[PDB]
């Protein structure tokens, strides 16, 4: 298979605007949302049909209870942070935990926190320690590292549980996650040459411009990989033309183990 990943995020907001949830948690497999929970609905719900169709109601009931607890814990943790930063107003707290199963069968696992959108604490599951970016984080690092058993627990979760669940979800969603829709690629002039691709899945794609068989990495404008709305993606890359010399330009696209070259006449 291609590389796949499972990730769960949490967002906490300390003084949210009216209606906006103080707490949101969403899971993803690759780029696909699979689950959602927030402090308004108080329910964990599927966000992909292949998730809903394979997990019975008692599953959603169980994790609804767990997320209600995680929500309270996140509030307490954010209250502690903003008090120790001595910050007024509304601030954000974020968590991301997840794992990857790479093509060669190796795995990775990660867990980190952010305050106001900046790295706050980063777990190292090999040295079993927390990296702290400032002295507020340093205080939390010491409290968490004093609980050695919970660091061992997270290492096991990242390396064993997370990968087991990812494989389970990959099979649930295999029709979606393991498919391939090759790109449709074209060039036009706008003076710069624009190489454009659309209709492809998975979103991972590499487009670049070659001049006379040499890759001019610093002379290329790489567009973002963007969702088209229908489950497929689009992207582009442009290079500028030298009107003082003749050169052979070619757009190169790699997607899901297939390479394409479009030579510009």
């Amino acid at each position, epitope marked *: 298979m291609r590389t796949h990943s499972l990730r769960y995020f949490r967002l906490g907001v300390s003084d949210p605007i009216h209606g906006v949830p103080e707490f949101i948690s969403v899971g993803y497999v690759d780029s696909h949302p699979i689950t959602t929970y927030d402090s308004v609905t108080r329910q964990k719900e599927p966000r992909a049909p292949w998730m809903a169709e394979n997990l019975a109601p008692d599953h959603w009931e169980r994790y609804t209870q767990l997320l*209600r*607890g995680w929500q309270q814990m996140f509030k307490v943790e954010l209250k502690r942070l903003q008090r120790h930063y001595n910050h007024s107003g509304s601030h954000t707290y974020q968590r991301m935990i997840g794992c990857e199963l790479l093509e060669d069968g190796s795995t990775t696992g990660f867990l980190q926190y952010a305050y106001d959108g900046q790295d706050f604490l980063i777990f190292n599951k090999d040295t079993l320690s927390w990296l702290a970016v400032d002295n507020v984080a340093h205080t939390i690092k010491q409290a968490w590292e004093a609980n050695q*058993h919970e660091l061992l627990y997270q290492k*096991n979760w990242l390396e064993e549980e997370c990968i087991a669940w990812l494989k389970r979800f990959l099979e649930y969603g295999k029709d979606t996650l393991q498919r391939t829709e090759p790109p449709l690629v074209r060039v036009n002039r706008k003076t710069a040459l624009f190489c454009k691709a659309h209709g492809f899945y998975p979103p991972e794609i590499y487009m670049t411009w070659m001049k006379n068989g040499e890759e001019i990495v610093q002379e290329i404008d790489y567009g973002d990989i963007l969702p088209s709305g229908d489950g497929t993606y689009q992207a582009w890359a442009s290079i500028e033309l030298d009107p003082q010399s003749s050169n052979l330009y070619s757009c190169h696209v790699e997607h899901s183990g297939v390479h394409m070259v479009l030579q510009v006449p």
Partner: antibody, heavy 109, light 116 residues
Framework: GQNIDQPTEMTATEGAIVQINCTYQ??????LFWYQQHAGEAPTFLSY??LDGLEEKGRFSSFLSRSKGYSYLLLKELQMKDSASYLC??????????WGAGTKLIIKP | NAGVTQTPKFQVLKTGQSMTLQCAQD?????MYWYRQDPGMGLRLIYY???????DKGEVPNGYNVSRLNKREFSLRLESAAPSQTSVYFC??????????????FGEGSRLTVLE
């Protein structure tokens, strides 16, 4: 199905050593707990293992093998006050505890 | 610093009688639990409360209900007692749930005997 097994009862001699075994087959794994419960009293926490190996805590050690789904609680230099039941429990993939039925440890003075 | 305090320690009941077991923890824990313990089997969860303001059934909820009255207290109700509910009931608490290594702290137990 999920299950957890430990011997019903064990008898050993004061001053000696005893190893209490616990095997489990679970939907995922997030750690294994041992508790002590004296007759007519509350269970109290003894140990937690989640990676492979042995942890020591005074006269008690707890061992875990994840690939074998096996743990033991090792009691050294047995004293009469060690007479109690010993409960093994596994936290599964959904963070639910599965409890073994307990091993009653009898100590001969 | 009382830990987990549950009452009553003992209670005899007639079939069909109502009974409330009380439980309180002063450890500022978020998660509370009600178990029954019977000979020859492991502890069986009746109902739990992952956090203040939420509860849900465990493995053997039928015949029981609970109230997470506040962060400290978690009562267990037998509305119509049955002989099969003869058991020893344990209340427990933990700092959180949905974490790995956090242990349970148990109350002293409540021994109930239900008789025709």
């Amino acid at each position: 199905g999920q299950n957890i097994d430990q011997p019903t009862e064990m008898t050993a001699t004061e001053g000696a050593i005893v190893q209490i075994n616990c095997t489990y087959q679970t939907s995922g794994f997030n750690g294994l707990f041992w508790y002590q419960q004296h007759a007519g009293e509350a269970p109290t926490f003894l140990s937690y293992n989640v990676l492979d190996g042995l942890e020591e805590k005074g006269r008690f050690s707890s061992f875990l093998s994840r690939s074998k789904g096996y743990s033991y609680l090792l009691l050294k230099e047995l004293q009469m006050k060690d007479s109690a039941s010993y409960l093994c429990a596994v936290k599964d993939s959904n963070y639910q505890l599965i409890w073994g039925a307990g091993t009653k440890l009898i100590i001969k003075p | 610093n009382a830990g987990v305090t549950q009452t009553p320690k003992f209670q005899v009941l007639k079939t069909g009688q109502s009974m409330t077991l009380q439980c309180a923890q002063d450890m500022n824990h978020n998660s509370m639990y009600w178990y029954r313990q019977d000979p020859g089997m492991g502890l069986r969860l009746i109902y739990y409360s992952a956090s203040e303001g939420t509860t849900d059934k465990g493995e053997v909820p039928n015949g029981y209900n609970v109230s997470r009255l506040n962060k400290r207290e978690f009562s267990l109700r037998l509305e119509s007692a049955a002989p099969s509910q003869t058991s020893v009931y344990f209340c427990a608490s933990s700092v959180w749930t949905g974490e790995g290594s956090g242990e349970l702290f148990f109350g002293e137990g409540s021994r109930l005997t239900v008789l025709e």
